[PDB]
């Protein structure tokens, strides 16, 4: 016998004590070793309701990642409100590692294994585990990176699809590589991401076909963001400790979906920025210029964050723009199939 409850989780990882890389240092202190023998138990004839948007595990992961960045990526200059803090800001070794979330004694985690589960409602194929799978705390906007993939069809996730203030998460079932480089020396802040146009456009066509299912076969259109901070109007992420901002206008190109001059490599222009708005929500930070040499991150695009235009009530089409900003949604994109219960 069990019931929905919230409690204090602990983390587990394969972090290395000798490693200088910052996620490793954090997890060596904060976490235990990965379950040497993970076993999940299928709950026969059991149906359980889930709600990925009201899942306190997400809150706890957000706290960890904020704590990790706070002690490893402190800005040389922090501007919060009007007060200026100056502190050291050495370059670091930075590359996210998988972190598992695990329940304390007297609690367990239920896991939804329905292959087209959208994050809310009833789940027919349920199992219990002691820990989630290993989740990398990748912070990004617009595109979800290095995450897990939908196993069957592309899945659309939203707390309320008709609520245009709610972010939509698209969960891909096939990843598309994005290859971002700041070349070794020259503008030291000029960088770019390369994506295979053919692959990306095929996926994006399937995404529109899935979206059509949720909006009455209406015409689906992508457009670039209409406003906001650069962290959200651009694909924002951290590669090797450096903050990237990439322009995704070419990535959401309707002309290609459905013409053929699109196949080929898509080169998005990016810039490294020393002065950023902190996704933590805590204000403006200023870092030192980028390290020398070839700065390169190849990532899997496994998800997309979207905002749908209002004012389309009695129109023939629906318009989507890349979104993000609320990093808790990043963790939701991976934690969606889990919930904590207390064993009575």
């Amino acid at each position: 016998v069990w019931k929905d409850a919230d409690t204090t989780l602990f983390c587990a990882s394969d972090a290395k004590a000798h490693e200088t890389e910052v996620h490793n240092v954090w997890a060596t202190h904060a976490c235990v070793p990965t379950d040497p023998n993970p076993q999940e138990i299928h709950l026969e004839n059991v149906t359980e309701n889930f709600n990925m948007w009201k899942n306190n595990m997400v809150e706890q992961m957000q706290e960890d990642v904020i704590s990790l960045w706070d002690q490893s990526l402190q800005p040389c200059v922090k501007l919060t409100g009007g007060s200026v803090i100056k502190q050291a800001c050495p370059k670091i070794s930075f590359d996210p590692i998988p972190i598992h979330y695990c329940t304390p004694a007297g609690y367990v985690i239920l896991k939804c294994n329905d292959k087209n589960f959208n994050g809310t409602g009833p789940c027919k194929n349920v199992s219990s585990v002691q820990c989630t799978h290993g989740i990398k705390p990748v912070v990004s906007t617009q595109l979800l990176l290095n995450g897990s993939l939908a196993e069957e069809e592309i899945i659309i996730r939203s707390e309320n699809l008709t609520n245009n203030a709610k972010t939509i998460i698209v969960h891909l079932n096939k990843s598309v590589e994005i290859n971002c480089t700041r070349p070794s020396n020259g503008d030291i802040r000029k960088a770019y991401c390369e994506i295979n146009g053919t692959k990306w456009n095929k996926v994006l066509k399937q995404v529109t076909e899935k979206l059509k299912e949720h909006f009455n076969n209406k015409t689906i259109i992508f457009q670039p963001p209409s406003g906001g901070d650069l962290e959200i109007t651009m694909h924002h992420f951290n590669c090797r400790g450096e903050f990237f901002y990439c322009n995704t206008t070419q990535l959401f190109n309707n002309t290609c979906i459905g013409m053929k001059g699109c196949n080929g490599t898509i080169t998005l222009p990016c810039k490294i920025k020393q002065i950023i708005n902190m996704w933590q929500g805590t204000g403006q930070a200023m870092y030192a210029p980028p390290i020398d040499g070839k700065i390169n991150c190849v990532s899997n695009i496994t998800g997309i964050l979207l905002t749908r235009d209002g004012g389309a009530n009695n129109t023939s089409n629906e318009t989507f723009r890349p979104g993000g900003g609320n990093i808790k949604d990043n963790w939701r994109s991976e934690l969606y199939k889990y919930k904590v219960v207390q064993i009575e």
Partner: antibody, heavy 125, light 102 residues
Framework: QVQLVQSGSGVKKPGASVRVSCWTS?????????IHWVRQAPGQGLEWIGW?????????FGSPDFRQRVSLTRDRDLFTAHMDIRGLTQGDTATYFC????????????????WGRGTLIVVSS | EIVLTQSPGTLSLSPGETASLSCTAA????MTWYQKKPGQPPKLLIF???KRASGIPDRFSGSQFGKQYTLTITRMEPEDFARYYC?????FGQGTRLEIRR
């Protein structure tokens, strides 16, 4: 039911631009996730114009016309939200309200618990 | 089609009586309700369909029958005579004008 503060009403010639501003206390702005703008034309109903998220400056609008002509921004340091309207038309004469939506509304839709007193904009030559 | 239909357009009642207003929505969705007096901004009364806002007296209630969302004001006071609007997401109802019957 404290009120949000708004700039004073005024008259604008057709085709001009205007900025309407909305500010409040640090505590309130801190507990505001979105600032919405809603207008009411004389003797008519309420019409949603758009929103801006206070934390990220993200926006959305009630129509292409609004997306085209209205800019929604905020200044987190001064706990203020701005609505810039350009190409003012006679159809834009209305009282414009700013209104607040809290964090964590979950699945219970849109409800604005604090409102500004409204700014009358009269478009006339 | 129309997303919200509010009724009645007008309602005439005596103080102490109970008013029943409805907003019939095309789709299910938590309903909000405002009071609106001339020269003053909307005042939140009910949200999440049936939850009362802070400081709102318990004579104001909200509920629903299927897609028919309803606002009830029992034992009306003078101060309660005004216009009333429902809001579901970005859409507002046409409004109900509640005036004193004599």
């Amino acid at each position: 039911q404290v009120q949000l503060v708004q700039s004073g009403s005024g008259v604008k010639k057709p085709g001009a631009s205007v900025r309407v501003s909305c500010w409040t206390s640090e505590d309130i702005f801190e507990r505001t996730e979105l600032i919405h703008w809603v207008r009411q034309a004389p003797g008519q109903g309420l019409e949603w114009i758009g929103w801006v998220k206070t934390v990220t400056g993200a926006v959305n609008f009630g129509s292409p016309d609004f997306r085209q002509r209205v800019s929604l921004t905020r200044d987190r340091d001064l706990f203020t939200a701005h609505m810039d309207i350009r190409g003012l038309t006679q159809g834009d004469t209305a009282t414009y309200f700013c209104a607040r939506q809290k964090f964590y509304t979950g699945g219970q839709g849109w409800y604005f618990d604090l409102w500004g007193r409204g700014t009358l904009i009269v478009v006339s030559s | 089609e129309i997303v919200l239909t509010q009724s009645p357009g007008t309602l005439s009642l005596s103080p102490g009586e109970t008013a029943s207003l409805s907003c019939t929505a095309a789709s299910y969705g938590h309903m909000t309700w405002y009071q609106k007096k001339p020269g003053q901004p909307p005042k939140l009364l009910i949200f999440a369909t049936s939850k009362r806002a802070s400081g709102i007296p318990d004579r104001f209630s909200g509920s629903q029958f299927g897609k028919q969302y309803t606002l009830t004001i029992t034992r009306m006071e003078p101060e309660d005579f005004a216009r009333y609007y429902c809001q579901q997401l970005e859409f507002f109802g046409q409004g109900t004008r509640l005036e004193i019957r004599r």
